[PDB]
Amino acid sequence: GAMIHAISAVNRHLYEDVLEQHFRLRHDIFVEERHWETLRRPDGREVDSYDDEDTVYLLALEGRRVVGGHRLYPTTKPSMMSEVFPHLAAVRGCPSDPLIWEWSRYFVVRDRRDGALNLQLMAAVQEFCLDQGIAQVSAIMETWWLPRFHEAGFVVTPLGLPALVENAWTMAATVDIRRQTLDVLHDRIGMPSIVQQDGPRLDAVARANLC
Numbered sequence: 001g002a003m004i005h006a007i008s009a010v011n012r013h014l015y016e017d018v019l020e021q022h023f024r025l026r027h028d029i030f031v032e033e034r035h036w037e038t039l040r041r042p043d044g045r046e047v048d049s050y051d052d053e054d055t056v057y058l059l060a061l062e063g064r065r066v067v068g069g070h071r072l073y074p075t076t077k078p079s080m081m082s083e084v085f086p087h088l089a090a091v092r093g094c095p096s097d098p099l100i101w102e103w104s105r106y107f108v109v110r111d112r113r114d115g116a117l118n119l120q121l122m123a124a125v126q127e128f129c130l131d132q133g134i135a136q137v138s139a140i141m142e143t144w145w146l147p148r149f150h151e152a153g154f155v156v157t158p159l160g161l162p163a164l165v166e167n168a169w170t171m172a173a174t175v176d177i178r179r180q181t182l183d184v185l186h187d188r189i190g191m192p193s194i195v196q197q198d199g200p201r202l203d204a205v206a207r208a209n210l211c
């Protein structure tokens, strides 16, 4: 059936159509719906300084329609946490490691909310990272994400004090990538694999080491 596709520098030539579609959906969702006005752009594409040659996109596709997704960025480069929100990680420190990737821009289009897709997206980050040998992901998120992580069996390590960010309670944390977490999620989604990787093989950890 429908799969989550891992899109990076090595295979984006197969997904240029899909990538553009997702930038516009990100604008509809994060700018128009969430009202994150600092991300508004006149081209109607929601693109920031962490959308570059090293970004990995995990996009839920139905045919060529993007129905959900999220992205990963190496913490060996300047990151959203290190550059924008370092005060949120003042207790433990901002991650900087080839084996830790920054996780952001999680979305499900309205048509697919409150269904099977969400848990598939939760499984997808675990599956991709385990395959790549990535040990942890880091995230800045609103505190309503905590019960969602816990419900999916995600092992969460807070990096600092929660704080108001543009009027919303926000925190920085890592998530442990675990075979055990993934195994349970595979059972729950009723699929042995949720991540499709077309085109040339990506060596994410090697790329992050170069950075």
Ligand SMILES: CC(C)CCSCCNC(=O)CCNC(=O)[C@H](O)C(C)(C)COP(=O)(O)OP(=O)(O)OC[C@H]1O[C@@H](n2cnc3c(N)ncnc32)[C@H](O)[C@@H]1OP(=O)(O)O
Binding pocket: 029, 030, 033, 034, 070, 103, 104, 105, 106, 107, 108, 109, 112, 113, 114, 115, 117, 118, 139, 140, 141, 144, 145
């Ligand atoms: C890498 C990550 C960490 C970066 C995040 S990046 C920021 C998170 N992303 C977004 O807010 C994008 C806009 N939203 C979406 O794409 C979807 O609403 C998401 C968050 C993916 C959730 O989709 P689904 O789980 O399929 O279903 P849903 O009915 O939309 O939500 C399920 C439950 O989740 C909760 N929820 C969703 N959005 C919320 C919000 N803005 N504030 C407080 N609570 C919120 C809520 O409890 C809801 O159930 P309800 O109470 O019955 O409505």
Ligand SMILES: C[S@@+](CC[C@H](N)C(=O)[O-])C[C@H]1O[C@@H](n2cnc3c(N)ncnc32)[C@H](O)[C@@H]1O
Binding pocket: 036, 037, 038, 039, 048, 049, 050, 080, 084, 103, 104, 105, 106, 140, 141, 142, 165, 166, 170
């Ligand atoms: C929870 S935080 C940031 C992380 C967000 N959950 C994500 O994964 O994309 C949301 C707040 O950070 C801001 N923000 C998101 N990406 C940003 C960037 N690249 N630069 C500056 N601010 C950003 C948004 O305007 C919003 O007020």
